[PDB]
């Protein structure tokens, strides 16, 4: 039936965040901090997907005793949306199997969501310029497309120690 770009945006937003929660949960971590940020994360992601400015959604999982990345989960946005498609899906099966592959985490591994955007993006309250933790000595792995609504898609990958 009929759908709008905002429908596709909303589907991808909720399911990116659902997927990241699942990653946190299945990685053995407490999703409470992710819940505390759900509202802020939703508004930022939905806004920058709506304007086409969101490039990547990133979850750094770091060791707080050394401040170095243990692992990192990326969702790259693919802007291939079409008004005459209508199909949608979320593929979290592959995410589950990649969790062993991403690496052993410390008991109290902490996490932080970050958003990579085009320069001309609109401001979103509370979000400001930040910096990536180093990925030196880490290896990117790709899981292919894990969420799509009507051509707007998210390609998931993870970084492991090499």
């Amino acid at each position: 039936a009929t759908y709008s770009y905002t429908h596709s945006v909303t589907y991808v937003t909720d399911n990116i965040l659902k997927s990241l929660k699942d990653i946190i949960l299945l990685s053995g971590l407490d999703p409470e901090h992710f819940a505390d940020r759900w509202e802020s994360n939703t508004r930022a992601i939905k806004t920058w997907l709506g304007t086409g400015d969101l490039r990547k959604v990133i979850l750094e999982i770091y060791n707080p005793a050394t401040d170095k990345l243990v692992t990192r989960w990326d969702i790259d946005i693919v802007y291939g949306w079409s008004d005459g498609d209508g199909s949608f899906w979320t593929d979290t099966e592959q995410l589950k199997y990649a969790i062993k592959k991403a690496g052993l985490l410390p008991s109290q591994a902490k996490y932080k969501l970050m958003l990579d955007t085009k320069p001309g993006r609109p401001d979103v309250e509370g979000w400001s310029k930040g910096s990536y933790r180093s990925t030196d000595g880490m290896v990117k792995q790709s899981l292919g497309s894990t969420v799509e609504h009507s051509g707007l898609a998210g390609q998931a990958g993870y970084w492991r120690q090499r």
Partner: protein, 132 residues
């Protein structure tokens, strides 16, 4: 013993955050007070469950000195359609007196959900949705 049900259009018509705020407004009838604050405090937990579609087949249940309110969520084509939606205001105070709100929760998330909820409320709880 009176039972009332409502059915809110969720993702992709509303995002999970918006869905919960709409349910907050229904349960507080627009009143700002302690109950609204408790409900707002667990927003992230409730939105995460909505994104999991936990309220699709097992409802959010509010109990009070008065009727028992069941709140379901529609998703995908049903949410855009709206055919089965019922978002009408409630004719009664849905959290009057000794109130409680039960969120349906997948068995495997009960650990972190109930712990997260208990930091903000002894009235907003979670239950294994496999039991209904």
């Amino acid at each position: 013993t009176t039972v009332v049900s409502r059915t809110f259009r969720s993702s992709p018509h509303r995002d999970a955050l918006q869905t919960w705020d709409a349910i907050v407004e229904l349960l507080t009838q627009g009143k700002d007070g302690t109950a609204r604050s408790e409900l707002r405090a667990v927003t992230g937990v409730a939105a995460s469950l909505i994104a999991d579609q936990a309220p699709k087949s097992a409802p959010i249940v509010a109990t009070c000195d008065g009727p028992r309110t069941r709140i379901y969520c529609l998703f995908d084509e049903d949410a855009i359609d709206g055919d089965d939606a019922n978002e009408e205001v409630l004719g009664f105070e849905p959290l009057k007196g000794d109130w409680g709100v039960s969120l349906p929760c997948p068995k495997e998330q009960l650990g972190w959900v109930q712990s997260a909820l208990k930091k903000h409320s002894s009235r907003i709880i979670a239950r294994d949705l496999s039991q209904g």
